[PDB]
Amino acid sequence: RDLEASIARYKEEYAVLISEAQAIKADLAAVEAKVNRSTALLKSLSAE
């Protein structure tokens, strides 16, 4: 029973970690779009 409890506890931590990872992934995605846009803007500026 104790072991089971421990496992359960671990699971929550794991879940939290996963959530964090997803958040980070989202952030990364957001950044990438900006970079894509930003590069284009830079190019435009150069042209001008």
Binding site: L3, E4, S6, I7, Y10
Partner: peptide, 10 residues
Amino acid sequence: VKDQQEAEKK
């Protein structure tokens, strides 16, 4: 997983 295995054993 390890914990689960242990539980199974015991």
